[PDB]
């Protein structure tokens, strides 16, 4: 069946105020199919409250949203970012990767989820000996959020815990 919505849903942040449902959807029916598509505004006023959000058929019209940044939107470059599981970080902390773990490992497994550029395997101060952790770096928040709601990470064998880095 259908992934969870949650999943499928993208906030926008940084609107015009003249931007409306029907100008917002139809700039992110570009996409994909678009099944909800709000902005918020005061309930006094109908003023815009300068966000909104948009959800989609799937979490690959997600991403293809997402990978058309950055959007303009009635004149506006607007933030569009995943619901959240927002604390947007470019860094992940990637545990359980043993002595055996090398650099190119996670760079053939997390390049796939975005442009990486650091990463850093964790050694002991003392010994030089690999702690069997890292932090990989990425040009871009969007990377991170896919990467963070999977449920599992597999690198070089290992079942790997992986968090936000702040
Ligand atoms: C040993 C490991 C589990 N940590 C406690 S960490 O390496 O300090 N680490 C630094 C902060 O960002 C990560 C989420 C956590």
């Not at 906030?11 to 449902?21: A, C, K, M």
Request: aromatic share 10%; proline share 3%.
């Amino acid at each position: 069946p259908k992934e969870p919505e949650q999943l499928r849903k993208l906030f926008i942040g940084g609107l015009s105020f003249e931007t409306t449902d029907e100008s917002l959807r139809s700039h992110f029916e570009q996409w994909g199919t678009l099944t909800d598509c709000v902005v918020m505004r005061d309930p006094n006023t109908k003023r815009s409250r300068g966000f909104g959000f948009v959800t989609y058929a799937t979490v690959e019209e997600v991403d293809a949203a997402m990978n058309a940044r950055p959007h303009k939107v009635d004149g506006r470059v607007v933030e569009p970012k995943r619901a959240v599981s927002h604390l947007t970080v470019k860094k992940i902390f990637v545990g359980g990767i043993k002595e055996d773990t090398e650099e190119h490992h996670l760079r053939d497994y997390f390049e796939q989820y975005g442009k990486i550029e650091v990463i850093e395997i964790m050694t002991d101060r003392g010994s030089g000996k690999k702690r069997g952790f890292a932090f990989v770096t990425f040009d871009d928040h969007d990377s991170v959020d896919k990467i963070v709601i999977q449920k599992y990470h597999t690198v070089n064998g290992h079942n790997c815990e992986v968090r936000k880095a702040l």
